[PDB]
Tab-separated table of C-alpha atoms and ligand atoms in Angstrom:
chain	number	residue	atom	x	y	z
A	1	UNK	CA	-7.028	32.952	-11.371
A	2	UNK	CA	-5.139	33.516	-8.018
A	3	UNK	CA	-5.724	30.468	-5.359
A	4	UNK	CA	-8.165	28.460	-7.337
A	5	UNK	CA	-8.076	25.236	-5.818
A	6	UNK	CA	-7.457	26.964	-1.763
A	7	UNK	CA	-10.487	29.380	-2.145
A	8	UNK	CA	-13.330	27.070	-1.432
A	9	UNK	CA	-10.802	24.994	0.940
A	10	UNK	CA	-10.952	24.871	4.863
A	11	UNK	CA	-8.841	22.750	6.869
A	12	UNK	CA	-8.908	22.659	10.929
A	13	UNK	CA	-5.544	21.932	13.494
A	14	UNK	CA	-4.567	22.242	16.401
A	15	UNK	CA	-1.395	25.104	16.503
A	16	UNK	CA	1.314	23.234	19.172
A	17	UNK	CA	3.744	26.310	19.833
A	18	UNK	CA	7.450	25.461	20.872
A	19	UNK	CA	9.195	27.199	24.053
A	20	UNK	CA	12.334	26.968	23.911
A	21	UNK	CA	13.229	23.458	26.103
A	22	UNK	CA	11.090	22.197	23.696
A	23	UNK	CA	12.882	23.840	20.562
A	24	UNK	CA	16.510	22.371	22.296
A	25	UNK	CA	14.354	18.745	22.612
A	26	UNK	CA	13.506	18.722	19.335
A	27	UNK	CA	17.194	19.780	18.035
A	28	UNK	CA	18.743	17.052	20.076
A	29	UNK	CA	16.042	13.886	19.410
A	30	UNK	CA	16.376	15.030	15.690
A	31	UNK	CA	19.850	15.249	15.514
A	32	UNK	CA	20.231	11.989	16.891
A	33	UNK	CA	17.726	10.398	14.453
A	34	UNK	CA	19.751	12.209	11.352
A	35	UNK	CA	22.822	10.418	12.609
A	36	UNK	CA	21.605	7.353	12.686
A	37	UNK	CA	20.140	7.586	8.942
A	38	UNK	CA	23.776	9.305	7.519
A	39	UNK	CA	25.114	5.664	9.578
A	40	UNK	CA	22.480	4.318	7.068
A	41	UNK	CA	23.124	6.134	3.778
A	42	UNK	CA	19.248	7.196	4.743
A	43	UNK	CA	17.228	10.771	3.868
A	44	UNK	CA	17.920	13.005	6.689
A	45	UNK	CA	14.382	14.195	8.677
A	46	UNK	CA	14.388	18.421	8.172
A	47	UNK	CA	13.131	19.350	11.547
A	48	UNK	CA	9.214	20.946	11.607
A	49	UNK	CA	10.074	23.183	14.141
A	50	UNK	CA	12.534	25.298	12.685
A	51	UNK	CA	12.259	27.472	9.520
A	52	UNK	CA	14.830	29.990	8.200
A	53	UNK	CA	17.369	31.738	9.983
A	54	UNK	CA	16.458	28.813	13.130
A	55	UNK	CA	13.118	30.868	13.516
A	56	UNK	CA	10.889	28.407	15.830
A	57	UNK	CA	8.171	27.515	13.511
A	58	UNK	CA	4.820	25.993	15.465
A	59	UNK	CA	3.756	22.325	15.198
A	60	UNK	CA	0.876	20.832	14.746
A	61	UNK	CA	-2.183	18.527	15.376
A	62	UNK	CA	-4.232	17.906	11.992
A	63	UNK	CA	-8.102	17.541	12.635
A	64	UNK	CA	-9.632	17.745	9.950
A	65	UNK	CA	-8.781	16.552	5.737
A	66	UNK	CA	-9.104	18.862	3.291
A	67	UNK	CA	-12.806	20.315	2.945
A	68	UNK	CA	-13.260	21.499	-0.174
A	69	UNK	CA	-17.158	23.548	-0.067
A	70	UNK	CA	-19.342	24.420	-2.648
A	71	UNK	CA	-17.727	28.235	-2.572
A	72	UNK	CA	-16.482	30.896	-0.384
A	73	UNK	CA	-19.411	31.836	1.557
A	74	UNK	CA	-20.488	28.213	2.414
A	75	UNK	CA	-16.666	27.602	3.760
A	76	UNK	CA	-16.805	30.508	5.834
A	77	UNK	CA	-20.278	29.753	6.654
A	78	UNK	CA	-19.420	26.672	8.145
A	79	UNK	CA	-15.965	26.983	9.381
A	80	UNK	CA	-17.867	29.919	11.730
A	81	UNK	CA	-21.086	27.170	12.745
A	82	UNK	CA	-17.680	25.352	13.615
A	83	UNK	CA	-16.358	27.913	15.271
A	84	UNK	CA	-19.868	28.523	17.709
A	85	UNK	CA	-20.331	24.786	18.131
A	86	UNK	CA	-16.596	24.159	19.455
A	87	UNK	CA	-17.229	27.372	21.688
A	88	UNK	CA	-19.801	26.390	22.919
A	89	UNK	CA	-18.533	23.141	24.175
A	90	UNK	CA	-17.553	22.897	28.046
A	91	UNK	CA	-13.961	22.489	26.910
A	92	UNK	CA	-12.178	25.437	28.304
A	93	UNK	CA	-8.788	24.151	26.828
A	94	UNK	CA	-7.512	20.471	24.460
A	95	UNK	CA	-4.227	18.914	26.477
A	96	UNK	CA	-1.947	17.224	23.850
A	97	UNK	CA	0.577	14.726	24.452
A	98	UNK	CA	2.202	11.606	23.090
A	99	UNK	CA	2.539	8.279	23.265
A	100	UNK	CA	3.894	5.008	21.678
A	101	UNK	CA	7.023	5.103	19.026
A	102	UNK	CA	7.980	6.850	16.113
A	103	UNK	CA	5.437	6.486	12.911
A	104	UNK	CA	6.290	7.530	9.342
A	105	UNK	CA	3.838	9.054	7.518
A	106	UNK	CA	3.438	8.947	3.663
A	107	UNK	CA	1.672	12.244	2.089
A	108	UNK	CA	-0.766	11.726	-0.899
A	109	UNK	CA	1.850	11.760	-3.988
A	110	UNK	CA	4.452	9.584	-1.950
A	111	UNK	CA	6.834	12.431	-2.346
A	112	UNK	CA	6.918	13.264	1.561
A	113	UNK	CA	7.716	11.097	4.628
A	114	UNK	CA	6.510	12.436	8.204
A	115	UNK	CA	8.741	10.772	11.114
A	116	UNK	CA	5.536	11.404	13.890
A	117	UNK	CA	4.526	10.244	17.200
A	118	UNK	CA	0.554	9.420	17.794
A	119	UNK	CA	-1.346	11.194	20.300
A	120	UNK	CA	-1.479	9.728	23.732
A	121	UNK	CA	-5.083	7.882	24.303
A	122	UNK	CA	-6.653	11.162	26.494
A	123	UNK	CA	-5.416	13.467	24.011
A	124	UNK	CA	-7.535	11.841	21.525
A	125	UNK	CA	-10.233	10.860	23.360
A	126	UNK	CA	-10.613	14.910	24.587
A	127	UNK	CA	-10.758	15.786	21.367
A	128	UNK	CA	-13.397	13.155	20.292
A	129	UNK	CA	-16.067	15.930	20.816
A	130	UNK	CA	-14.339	18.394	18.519
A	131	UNK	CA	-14.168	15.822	15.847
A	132	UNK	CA	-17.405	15.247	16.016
A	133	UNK	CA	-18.115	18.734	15.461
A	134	UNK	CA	-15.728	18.719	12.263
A	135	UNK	CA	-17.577	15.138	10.973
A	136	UNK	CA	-21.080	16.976	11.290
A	137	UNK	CA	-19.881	20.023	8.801
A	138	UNK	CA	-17.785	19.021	6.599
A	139	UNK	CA	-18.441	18.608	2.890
A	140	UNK	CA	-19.577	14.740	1.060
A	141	UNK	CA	-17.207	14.824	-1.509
A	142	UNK	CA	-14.067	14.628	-0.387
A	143	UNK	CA	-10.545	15.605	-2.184
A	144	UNK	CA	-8.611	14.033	0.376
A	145	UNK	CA	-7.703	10.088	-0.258
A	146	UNK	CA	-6.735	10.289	3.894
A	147	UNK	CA	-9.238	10.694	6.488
A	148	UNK	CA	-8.367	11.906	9.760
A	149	UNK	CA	-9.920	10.848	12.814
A	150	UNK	CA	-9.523	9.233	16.011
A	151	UNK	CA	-7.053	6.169	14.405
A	152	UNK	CA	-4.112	8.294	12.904
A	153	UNK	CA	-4.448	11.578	15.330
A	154	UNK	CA	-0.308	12.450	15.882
A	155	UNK	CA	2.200	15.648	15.767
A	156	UNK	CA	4.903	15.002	12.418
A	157	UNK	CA	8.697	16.357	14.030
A	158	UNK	CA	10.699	15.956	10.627
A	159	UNK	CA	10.432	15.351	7.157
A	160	UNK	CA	12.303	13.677	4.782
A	161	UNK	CA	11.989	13.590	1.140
A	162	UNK	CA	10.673	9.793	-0.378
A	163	UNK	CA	14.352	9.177	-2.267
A	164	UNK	CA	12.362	6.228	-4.015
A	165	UNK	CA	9.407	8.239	-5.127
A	166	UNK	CA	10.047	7.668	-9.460
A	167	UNK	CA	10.829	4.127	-8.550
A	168	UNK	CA	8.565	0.801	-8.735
A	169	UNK	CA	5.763	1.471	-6.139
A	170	UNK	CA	7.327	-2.257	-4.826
A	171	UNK	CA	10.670	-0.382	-4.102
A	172	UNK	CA	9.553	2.739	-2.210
A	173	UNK	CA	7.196	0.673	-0.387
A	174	UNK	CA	10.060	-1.741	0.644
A	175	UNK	CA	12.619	1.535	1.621
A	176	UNK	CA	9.976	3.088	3.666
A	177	UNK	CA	9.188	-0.177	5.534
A	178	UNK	CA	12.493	-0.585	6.106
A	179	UNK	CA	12.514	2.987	7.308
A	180	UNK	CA	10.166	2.771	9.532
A	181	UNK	CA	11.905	-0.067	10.601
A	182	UNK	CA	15.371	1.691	11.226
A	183	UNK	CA	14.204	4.678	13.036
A	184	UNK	CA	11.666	2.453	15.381
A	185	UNK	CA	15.053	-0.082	16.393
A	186	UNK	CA	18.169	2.197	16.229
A	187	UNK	CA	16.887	5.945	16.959
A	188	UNK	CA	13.829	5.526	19.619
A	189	UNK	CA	16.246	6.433	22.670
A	190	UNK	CA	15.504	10.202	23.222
A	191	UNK	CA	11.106	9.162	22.938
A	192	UNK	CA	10.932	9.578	26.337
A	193	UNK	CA	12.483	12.844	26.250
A	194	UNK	CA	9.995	13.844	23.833
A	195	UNK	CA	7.049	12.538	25.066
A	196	UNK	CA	8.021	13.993	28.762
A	197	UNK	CA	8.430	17.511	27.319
A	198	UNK	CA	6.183	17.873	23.702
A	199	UNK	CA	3.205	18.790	25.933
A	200	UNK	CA	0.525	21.187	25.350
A	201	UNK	CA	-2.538	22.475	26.622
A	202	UNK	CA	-4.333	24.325	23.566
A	203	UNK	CA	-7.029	27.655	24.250
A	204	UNK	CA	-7.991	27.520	20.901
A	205	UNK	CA	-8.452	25.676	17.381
A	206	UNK	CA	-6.982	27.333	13.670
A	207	UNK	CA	-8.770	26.904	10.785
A	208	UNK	CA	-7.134	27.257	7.310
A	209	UNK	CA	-9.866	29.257	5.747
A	210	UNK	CA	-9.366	29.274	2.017
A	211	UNK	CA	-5.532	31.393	1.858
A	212	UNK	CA	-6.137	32.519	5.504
A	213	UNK	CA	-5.544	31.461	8.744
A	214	UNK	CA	-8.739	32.178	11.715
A	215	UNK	CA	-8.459	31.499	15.415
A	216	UNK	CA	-11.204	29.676	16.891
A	217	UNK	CA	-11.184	30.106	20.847
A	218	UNK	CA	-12.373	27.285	23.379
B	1	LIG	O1	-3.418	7.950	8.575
B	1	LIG	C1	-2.761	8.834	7.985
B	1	LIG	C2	-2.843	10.174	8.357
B	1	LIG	C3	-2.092	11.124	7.682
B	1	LIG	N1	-1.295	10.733	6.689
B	1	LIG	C4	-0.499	11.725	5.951
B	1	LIG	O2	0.577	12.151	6.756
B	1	LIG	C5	0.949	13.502	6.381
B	1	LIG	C6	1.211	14.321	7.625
B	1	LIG	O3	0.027	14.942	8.114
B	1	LIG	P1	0.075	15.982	9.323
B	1	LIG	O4	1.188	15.511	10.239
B	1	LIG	O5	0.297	17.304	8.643
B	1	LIG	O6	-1.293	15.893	9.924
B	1	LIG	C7	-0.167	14.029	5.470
B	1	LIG	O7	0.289	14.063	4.119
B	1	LIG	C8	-1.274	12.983	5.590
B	1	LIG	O8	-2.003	12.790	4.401
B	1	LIG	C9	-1.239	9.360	6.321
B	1	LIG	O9	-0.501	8.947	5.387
B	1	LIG	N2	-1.969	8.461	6.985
């Protein structure tokens, strides 16, 4: 069939939307991290906010894993007693911002490597309410292997493949510690730049709702 796995599938962000000081800010801090890992014989990260032909492409905060419900009408069910709850919250609008270093992020078949910064201790704690919301609806089982919640909130900037990904598990673990290693002592100069300028103050929530993207206003 045609989306089997996505149809019973919601997934809930936040949609971070680049002007364009932010799109230069995030041209420059990423060029200078890709310089430092060509110095290294290193992946380069391919900047998130930038798609084909330069196009600004939005990034984002992740606040929910994958929910995987019983079928269609339950997801959109409950991705809509989502979208009332949030509403009818006080919050009028989410700030996001940054804080701490660069993190690198593994995805679930090792294949991927996010270079991120965590959300700044407000940020998260604002959105402790919404996440609440998400923990109350979302499905038992889970198909995720990563939670998300209040520990590993952040925005990913770049992504590099895992070059050591058909390797001995010992030897990608090793390059991506050392990784996270390299970019945290010899590419951290422009973090301040970001963290000044990669702010946000969000109206609404998305949902992925099976292949579909919804808008859920504040
Ligand atoms: O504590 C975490 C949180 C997320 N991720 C992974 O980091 C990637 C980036 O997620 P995001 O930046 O799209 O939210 C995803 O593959 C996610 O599974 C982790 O490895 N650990």
């Amino acid at each position: 069939m045609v989306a089997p796995v996505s149809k019973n599938i919601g997934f809930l962000f936040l949609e971070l939307r680049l002007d364009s000081k932010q799109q230069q800010i995030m041209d420059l801090v990423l060029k200078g991290v890709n310089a430092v890992m060509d110095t290294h014989h290193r992946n380069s990260f391919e900047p998130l906010h930038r798609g084909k032909f330069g196009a600004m492409k939005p990034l984002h905060v992740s606040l929910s894993e994958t929910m995987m419900f019983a079928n269609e009408s339950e997801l959109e069910e409950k991705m809509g007693r989502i979208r009332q709850e949030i509403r009818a919250l006080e919050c009028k609008s989410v700030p996001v911002a940054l804080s701490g270093g660069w993190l690198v992020y593994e995805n679930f078949d090792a294949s991927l490597q996010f270079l991120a910064v965590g959300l700044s201790e407000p940020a998260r704690g604002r959105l402790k309410p919404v996440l609440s919301i998400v923990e109350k609806y979302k499905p038992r089982s889970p198909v995720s292997r990563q939670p998300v919640g209040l520990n590993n909130l952040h925005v990913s900037f770049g992504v590099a493949q895992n070059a050591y990904l058909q390797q001995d598990e010992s030897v990608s673990r090793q390059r991506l510690d050392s990784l996270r290693n390299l970019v945290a002592t010899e590419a951290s100069d422009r973090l301040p730049l970001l963290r000044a300028n990669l702010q946000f103050r969000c109206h609404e929530l998305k949902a992925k709702v099976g292949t579909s993207v919804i808008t859920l206003p504040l």
